[PDB]
Design a protein around this ligand. Structure first.
Ligand SMILES: [Mg+2]
Ligand SMILES: [Mg+2]
Ligand SMILES: [Mg+2]
Ligand SMILES: [Mg+2]
Ligand SMILES: [Mg+2]
Ligand SMILES: [Mg+2]
Ligand SMILES: [Mg+2]
Ligand SMILES: [Mg+2]
Ligand SMILES: [Mg+2]
Ligand SMILES: [Mg+2]
Ligand SMILES: [Mg+2]
Ligand SMILES: [Mg+2]
Ligand SMILES: [Mg+2]
Ligand SMILES: [Mg+2]
Ligand SMILES: [Mg+2]
Ligand SMILES: [Mg+2]
Ligand SMILES: [Mg+2]
Ligand SMILES: [Mg+2]
Ligand SMILES: [Mg+2]
Ligand SMILES: [Mg+2]
Ligand SMILES: [Mg+2]
Ligand SMILES: [Mg+2]
Ligand SMILES: [Mg+2]
Ligand SMILES: [Mg+2]
Ligand SMILES: [Mg+2]
Ligand SMILES: [Mg+2]
Ligand SMILES: [Mg+2]
Ligand SMILES: [Mg+2]
Ligand SMILES: [Mg+2]
Ligand SMILES: [Mg+2]
Ligand SMILES: [Mg+2]
Ligand SMILES: [Mg+2]
Ligand SMILES: [Mg+2]
Ligand SMILES: [Mg+2]
Lengths: 113, 127, 47, 57, 117
RNA sequence: AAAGGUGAAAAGAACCCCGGGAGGGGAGUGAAAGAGAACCUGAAACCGUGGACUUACAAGCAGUCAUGGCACCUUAUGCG
RNA sequence: GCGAGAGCUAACUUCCGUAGCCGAGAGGGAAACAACCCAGACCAUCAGCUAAGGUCCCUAAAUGAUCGCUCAGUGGUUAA
RNA sequence: GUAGGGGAGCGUUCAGUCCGCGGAGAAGCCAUACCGGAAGGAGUGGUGGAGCCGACUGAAGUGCGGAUGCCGGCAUGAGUAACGAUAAAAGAAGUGAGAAUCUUCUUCGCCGUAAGGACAAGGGUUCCUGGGGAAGGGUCGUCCGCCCAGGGAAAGUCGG
């Protein structure tokens, strides 16, 4: 069955609107607390977005401008963070499994830079 | 002794290691499910296991294990670093019945079971 | 769909009330034959 | 349509059904720093220690 | 004056439920199934009294048949030559002799055969 | 419609303990708290903890009746 | 079962007659089986003889005795 | 031995009467291997807390497994089905004993002749402030249209 991704019991338009707001904050604040899954969903998409931003050219900034809608944040990853990330080939994120919770009873996680 | 009345006069009941969650809003069988892991285990163990059992009835159950340990150490002058779960069980409370409407005209008695959760702590030594 | 009971204050009272229930013989009769059964609820006037 | 059960079931079977519902016990360990108890591969919840510190005390 | 059951029924009932033990499921615990189970149990008691009288007789028999055959005799022939020499032994006893008392059974055999020919 | 009962008397439980609580464990009152306010007895169905003897090649109205095993000994060491 | 009628010398058929049985009948036998063959259970017995029906093992009791038949598994399902 | 007729009795209450017991403990309940031909009835042990056994006689709402019986309780089905529109949610911040659900923030998604706004009929304090969390909430709740307390409604011209 070589397929690949998560449907995360949302549609497909949703799926995107999510990992775009989630990338938006992970970039907006170094780490986030969120479901372990939705995290292992947010890892390689933020990561790839790092590799777009890591480039300088105006293009890369409109390329980012598509997924990450807020200027301040764009500007942050473009100007501030991505450059900082120069000499490192990958692994711009990491994942931590905390524990449970009351209502849903689901495992939980911190995903950080 | 002679009379039952005389025994009543003389002795009094002391409850060693025992405490009771009365009238707790949770179904017996559920809560038993947590509690089946506590039983007969190093009482602190029970405090730990009950931090990582992810069921809802973890917490009222733990609450009653501190009560027991409490009552066992204080009220009964026991030995913390050798205290354990001699007994553990739960039985039914007065179950809490209310109506739910259903398809067409029909109705329904839906029962919100209560629980009498109860643990007895004790001293465990081999010789 | 739409239901039997669509309240109407003026209807309610002009239909079941007390001036109404006394206006007729069989309503006097309803009255005292209620009173005897110790109704607090004498009449929709008493709502 | 509308299948129901034929006969009331016994205490005996019924409790043979339950034969598995038995909860599995969190397999736990003690957490090199703060010293409460951590779940393997997760953060030791008291201090916040995965190897240095993360979530805070 | 009115007279509730008050007590009597619980009495009757317990009587049954105390007869009623060892019984598997509901049988040992609910009245109706209990008393019931016991109706049939009645049937089985009566018949099986006379019955065991049969069964034991069978048992004694097969043991004797054995005995006879252990030398060269048939049951029927042994027992018949033990009717012939008039040796009016119960057969329960004959089993006993046969299985717990060897050389005695031996002699009783030699006897039956003698009286047979 | 279903609805009744602490105690002799409120002497209705100051006060310490685990908990936000609920609830309980002491204490103290009482004769008794084996009456503590879900407060007289507390049957049965029904749910559980512990213990004895048992049960994973077996076919069953669940009993009967015969024998062996194991266990127990207050109308009870034999007809158990 | 024996007598007859209606039937198709069909029926777990129906309508009379007649004997027994079940109904209101347990017990043994016919594998199983209200009716059939033996037989009418006042209780007890770890006592004996028989009935119908049986006696290689299941399953009590002669793998009996002598004069034979069939070789077809007839026995263990029908006819011109 | 079925329908049926006959014979002798067991238990329940109320009643007359006698024997008589009971806070060193009544009835009722619980256990058991004793007795009687049976309905039944005794011994002892544990319960209970204030009434009761026995004999004789009288009178009955006088003995329940059934009636798809009536009332009530608790089981099965089952930790199953479902949690009430497929308009959709994320991260941070805060509070608390406890938060996926309550309060801020920044976004996202849906309605937009409505899923906005104003009336009438009906409802009746559901409005506002401060508080609470048993139960109502289809989960959770620190929250609420639920609980508590206190406030709020003003007409010569609107409406009668
Ligand atoms: Mg889902
Ligand atoms: Mg779309
Ligand atoms: Mg005292
Ligand atoms: Mg409706
Ligand atoms: Mg015989
Ligand atoms: Mg308290
Ligand atoms: Mg057991
Ligand atoms: Mg085999
Ligand atoms: Mg086996
Ligand atoms: Mg006919
Ligand atoms: Mg008849
Ligand atoms: Mg017969
Ligand atoms: Mg027969
Ligand atoms: Mg037979
Ligand atoms: Mg027949
Ligand atoms: Mg013969
Ligand atoms: Mg044989
Ligand atoms: Mg009297
Ligand atoms: Mg009385
Ligand atoms: Mg009934
Ligand atoms: Mg039916
Ligand atoms: Mg499941
Ligand atoms: Mg199912
Ligand atoms: Mg399923
Ligand atoms: Mg489902
Ligand atoms: Mg919904
Ligand atoms: Mg959804
Ligand atoms: Mg802020
Ligand atoms: Mg805080
Ligand atoms: Mg929500
Ligand atoms: Mg509107
Ligand atoms: Mg409000
Ligand atoms: Mg709730
Ligand atoms: Mg608060």
């Amino acid at each position: 069955h070589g397929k690949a991704g998560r449907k995360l019991n949302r549609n497909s338009s949703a799926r995107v609107a999510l990992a775009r707001a989630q990338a938006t904050a992970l970039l907006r604040e170094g780490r986030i607390q969120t479901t372990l899954t939705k995290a292992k969903e947010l890892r390689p998409f933020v990561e790839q977005l790092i590799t777009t931003a890591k480039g300088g050219d105006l293009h890369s900034r409109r390329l980012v401008a598509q997924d990450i809608h807020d200027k301040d944040v764009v500007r942050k990853v473009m100007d501030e963070v991505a450059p900082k990330y120069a000499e490192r080939p990958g692994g711009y994120t990491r994942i931590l499994r905390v524990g449970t919770r009351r209502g849903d009873g689901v495992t939980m996680a911190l995903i950080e830079l | 002794f002679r009379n039952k009345k005389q025994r009543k006069q003389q002795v009094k009941l002391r409850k060693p290691g025992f405490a009771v969650a009365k009238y707790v809003r949770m179904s017996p069988r559920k809560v038993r499910l947590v509690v089946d892991v506590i039983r007969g285990k190093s009482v602190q163990d029970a405090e730990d296991l009950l931090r990582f059992i992810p069921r809802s009835a973890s917490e009222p159950v733990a609450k009653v294990l501190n009560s027991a340990k409490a009552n066992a150490l204080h009220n009964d002058e026991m030995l913390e670093d050798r205290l354990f779960v001699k007994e553990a069980y739960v039985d039914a409370g007065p179950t809490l019945k209310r109506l739910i409407p259903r398809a067409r005209g029909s109705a329904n008695i839906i029962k919100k079971r209560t629980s009498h959760i109860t643990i007895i702590v004790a001293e465990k030594g081999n010789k | 769909m739409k239901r039997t009971y669509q309240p109407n204050n003026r209807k309610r009272a002009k239909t079941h009330g007390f001036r109404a229930r006394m206006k007729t013989k069989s309503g006097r009769n309803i009255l005292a034959r209620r009173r005897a059964k110790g109704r607090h609820q004498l009449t929709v006037s008493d709502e | 349509k509308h299948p129901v059960p034929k006969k009331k079931t016994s205490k005996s079977k019924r409790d043979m059904r339950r034969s598995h519902h038995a909860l599995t016990a969190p397999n736990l360990t003690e957490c090199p720093q703060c010293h409460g108890k951590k779940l393997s591969h997760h953060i030791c919840p008291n201090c916040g220690y995965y190897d240095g510190r993360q979530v805070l005390a | 004056p009115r007279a509730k059951t008050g007590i009597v029924r619980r009495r009757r009932h317990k009587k049954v439920l105390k007869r009623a033990k060892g019984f598997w499921g509901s049988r040992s615990k609910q009245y109706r199934n209990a008393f019931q189970t016991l109706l049939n149990a009645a049937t089985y008691e009566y018949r099986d009294r006379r019955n065991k009288k049969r069964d034991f007789r069978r048992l004694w028999i097969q043991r004797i048949n054995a005995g006879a055959r252990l030398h060269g005799m048939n049951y029927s022939t042994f027992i018949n030559g033990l009717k012939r020499a008039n040796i009016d032994l119960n057969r329960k006893v004959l089993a006993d002799i046969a299985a717990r008392e060897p050389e005695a059974f031996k002699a009783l055999v030699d006897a039956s055969r003698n009286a047979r020919q």
